[PDB]
Write the structure tokens for this entry.
Amino acid sequence: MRECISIHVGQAGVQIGNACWELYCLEHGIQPDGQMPSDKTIGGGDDSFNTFFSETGAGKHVPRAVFVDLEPTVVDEVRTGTYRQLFHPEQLITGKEDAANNYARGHYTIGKEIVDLVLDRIRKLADLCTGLQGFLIFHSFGGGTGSGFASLLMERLSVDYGKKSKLEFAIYPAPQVSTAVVEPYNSILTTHTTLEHSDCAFMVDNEAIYDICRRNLDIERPTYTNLNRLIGQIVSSITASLRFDGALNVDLTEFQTNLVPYPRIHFPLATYAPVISAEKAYHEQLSVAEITNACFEPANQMVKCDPRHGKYMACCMLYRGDVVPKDVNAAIATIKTKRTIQFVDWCPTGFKVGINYQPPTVVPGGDLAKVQRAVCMLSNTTAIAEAWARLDHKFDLMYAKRAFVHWYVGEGMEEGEFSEAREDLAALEKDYEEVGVD
Amino acid sequence: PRKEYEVACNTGAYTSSGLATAGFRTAKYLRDEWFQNSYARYHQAFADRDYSERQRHESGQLVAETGALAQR
Amino acid sequence: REMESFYSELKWQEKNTLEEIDALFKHLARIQADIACKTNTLLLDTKCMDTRRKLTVPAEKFVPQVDTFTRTTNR
Amino acid sequence: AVNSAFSSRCQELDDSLQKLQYHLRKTLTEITDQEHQIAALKQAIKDKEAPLEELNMSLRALKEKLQDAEQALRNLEDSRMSLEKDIAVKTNSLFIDRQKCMTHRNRYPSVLQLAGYQ
Amino acid sequence: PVHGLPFLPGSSFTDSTKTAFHRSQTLNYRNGYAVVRRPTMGIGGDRLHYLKQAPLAEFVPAHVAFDKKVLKFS
Amino acid sequence: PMGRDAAGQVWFTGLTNSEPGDAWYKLPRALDTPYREAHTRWHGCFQSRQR
Amino acid sequence: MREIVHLQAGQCGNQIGAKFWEVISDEHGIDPTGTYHGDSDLQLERINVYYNEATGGKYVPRAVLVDLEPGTMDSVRSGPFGQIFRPDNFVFGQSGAGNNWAKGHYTEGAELVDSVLDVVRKEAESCDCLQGFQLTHSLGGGTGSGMGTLLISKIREEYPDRIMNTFSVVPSPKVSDTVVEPYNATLSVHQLVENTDETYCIDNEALYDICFRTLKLTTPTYGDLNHLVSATMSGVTTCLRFPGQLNADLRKLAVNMVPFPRLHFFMPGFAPLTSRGSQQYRALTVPELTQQMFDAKNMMAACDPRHGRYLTVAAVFRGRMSMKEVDEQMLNVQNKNSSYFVEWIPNNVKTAVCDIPPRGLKMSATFIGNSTAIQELFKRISEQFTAMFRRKAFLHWYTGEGMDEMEFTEAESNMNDLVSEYQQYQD
Ligand SMILES: Nc1nc2c(ncn2[C@@H]2O[C@H](COP(=O)(O)OP(=O)(O)OP(=O)(O)O)[C@@H](O)[C@H]2O)c(=O)[nH]1
Ligand SMILES: Nc1nc2c(ncn2[C@@H]2O[C@H](COP(=O)(O)OP(=O)(O)OP(=O)(O)O)[C@@H](O)[C@H]2O)c(=O)[nH]1
């Protein structure tokens, strides 16, 4: 019925899945063994899990996902973790070599001999699939191995399936932090590949995750654990409509139809308000007005950009927990008559409202508080142009000095694709400033 | 010790677990002592396991020490 | 039955080797250890066989009487 | 309200069993490891025997360590046997309540026929 | 000396009483095949460490199972 | 025992491991019958009254 | 799976391999006999990255060892670990060399290259999927250079996809005992610059300076020197065999590391070296870890990066750390001297982190860098060559060998290209 399929590529895409299921087991209460208790749900596989798991006759819930990596280390690690029985062994596909962060290396040298297996697995899931709304894809623009494989297999599956949406959740490059010098290269390669075939691509950056972590969570030694925990909670929030019931419902189809204005520009942002520490929530108050004020607070976003320097296109806000439309509409009207937020003269409204009764849940041993009213914020803005405006004037320099290019040319590519990515990016910006202009 | 706390817990016009002075006590239990029984099981297991692993550590150290001493 | 027979023959062989007294001492070592393990086995077996009567014997009479030698220590 | 309370009770007991087996697995693995090292200890004392004062004192200390290691092992299996017996009891009780009660409760009547076709 | 403490690159043991310094020869040629010895003496000279059938039936056919068997009655 | 020793065991509470009835093919009364007269005679009179 | 086959050359290599193998052995936890000892498992599962299995739980090295001097082999054989090696592989020569470069590269190797090649290719077939080779040898030493240039020239063509790491020892800038050592250096480097992909270059003087500054311990052993370098090898190879993210392929590093084909040489560095008593006078915290880590005295390979500027750096860390402290430390130092870097490229740091430390110390790190500081060494040697070749004394031996000066001519301008190109980019 209302089910989707998950894919992870590159070694950046594996911790995040690991955490996503470490959570996703809990809201239906499935032990690492994989069995609902004797409470009467087991059978052919119909109940709210159905969107996530296919628990067949043996009573074992089955993730509808694929984890493909190119180095056996982490895949065998998780195969030796607790959840090895939970996962399907060959749904964890392992390669033997690294992409060297060389996009073309990963896209032509090795990409030809695993795509067959992965697409065959996709078919043998899509057969049993019923609703097949689409896919949730995890890669990384700083793809250590994710980039080229993602581009190639995404092109193949895009041409093979032309009747559904595609969601991409990418960790965007850290603007002033780099663990890789080939990062600008493979980042822009992936961009000018994907922008024409991603249906909804969302960005997130990790420096700002840390910044939030030591602003309001009050913790000074966080890690991947907390990072991925909150990110997984975000994706849980955006799938809660499919997960549970409520007053009224929303769906990714509506997200597409109303959020993205036009063709091409489909690069929105996400935001979460009630990330608060235990003591801080203990003797303070939370409600709709303040959570909305804190969400539109500019620094609480997870991309280093200034909406005050930007101009707004669209906004979809999802409330999870218990609320009333009275306060909903009152507060959103207050924000509508707020002053700093420069909405374009185009859109008189910009607000897609969704509600669900079931509150978000905790992870055992985690860090977030015991919240009753959560909210997720998706937004089309013109403020993101700064990231590309920064990237281009680094890449032009490092390419006019054309260091490291020997790698790529000796493995087969040449400067033409780089040159083309240049003007693809240029067209991106050029569209953005003019749509921002009244 | 336990005497004072049982007196404190069971004194009012509400219910009463017959936690007698001595001799066999009543088979029926209460939620608090039930949870306590669980926690006691868990801590007993922890203690035993940690003791064993400690022993194995100093055993290994002693084996190495004596072997090298003899090899001298 | 079969464990007991094995035990008895083992003891006899050990004894003969004893009155006979390098490899000989080595074989003494193996036989000694084997006797130890066999004794452990037979004692555990008798312990287990004790508790069977619970399903048959009249209630007032049942009392185990093999190994109420409480061995656990730490507590 | 009876229904709700009953459900909560059952869920909590299920969680208890979860925790129990989680413990049992690594308990057994530790037991095995202890036995391995003790066998290595017998072999090592024979190795120490090979080169035949200080030696005598060392040998006596080693044999004392033999004793306390064996003691630890025995306490281990006592804990184990306790754990299995309690496992059996808990599972049987969960079967009892998860079968009889709600299956007979489905027979509960309906409001209109309690009103007597009002 | 903890007889196997963490052998950090920083510190290690050191000895002084050794006098006899000779190197054992375990490698030589001797013939067409080059020949390598098992080394025995170390620096200065010191000790190193080296069926389902039917037993009672066999399926005799019935004929023989009842051949020449008569009960006699008066 | 209350003390250094303890056996957590389960004793039978005898009513079903029994042959209570009466008949000639049972009157030989092998002395291994757990036939404590209290509850049996109490039964006798109690069925007598309940009848 | 992914595996490595180790090559050992020259009289340096004799003890280098000894120390290095015993380090990795007692790291994974193997007895001197060769039987496994299970305390940590991940090491056991990943031991196949280097070792080859022998029946009865014994784990033979995948080493191939060669020299021409037999006494070094005999000493290695007699050492407290040499028994772990296998007599199958001790290919050797039938005389000495006098570590003349021309002899070492042309006459003697002719009859031994076949045997060494056959052994190594048997090993290569046996293993599954090779990342590449690592060689421990000398560039200033004679016979190691003579054999090594031959073998490295031989192997590249068959295996032109593979990581041909070369790890050597550089002559002293002050005194080297060996006198034709210059000519060894020039002839070795002439092939090595074209042929290798990565080369680590380290020198003894700074080791002695390290002994005085931080070891403080008066009388060292060359064994302890080899320990101080075996730490660097252990570090640089940690990441392959252990879990916890860090994309660890040395090629994953190299593409990130080197900008141009003629830039292969790098300058190592180690992490906490604690003095006699500072162990409890130091707060073992990541800030001061990095403080000592990137220093003018912690460095020990060739010379101070002060004289020039850096192109690229790579730091590996081993221990229960987090992103933040290392990331913001890098930002702090980036601000501290945003000048001595190259505006050529921003964010010229590579960072890698693995969670399972070595034993003895909880936190650890290893440094490697590519900075504009090789000109010192290569200038020095270039003027030495011009001075010596001015009247070409002692070149009679090479004339007899058949060496003639046109090879000197071809090499010297290659080093001229090196110097000019290094200076050209950064200035
Ligand atoms: N979400 C997530 N991000 C990570 C993780 N590890 C690293 N990252 C960040 O995401 C990026 C990882 O991409 P890559 O390093 O190319 O990994 P890969 O393409 O899967 O393959 P490799 O070349 O082997 O690294 C890095 O820039 C990391 O900073 C992780 O475990 N989870
Ligand atoms: N193994 C080892 N090498 C040392 C030691 N001390 C210095 N070295 C250096 O290691 C260098 C390399 O030796 P090899 O690689 O075997 O070189 P070679 O071809 O035999 O030529 P030569 O060094 O001239 O004998 C020597 O030149 C020394 O400078 C030491 O104590 N042990």
About this structure: The two ends of chain A are 43 Å apart (CA to CA). Chain A is about 40% helix and 15% strand. Chains A and E do not touch (no CB pair under 8 Å).
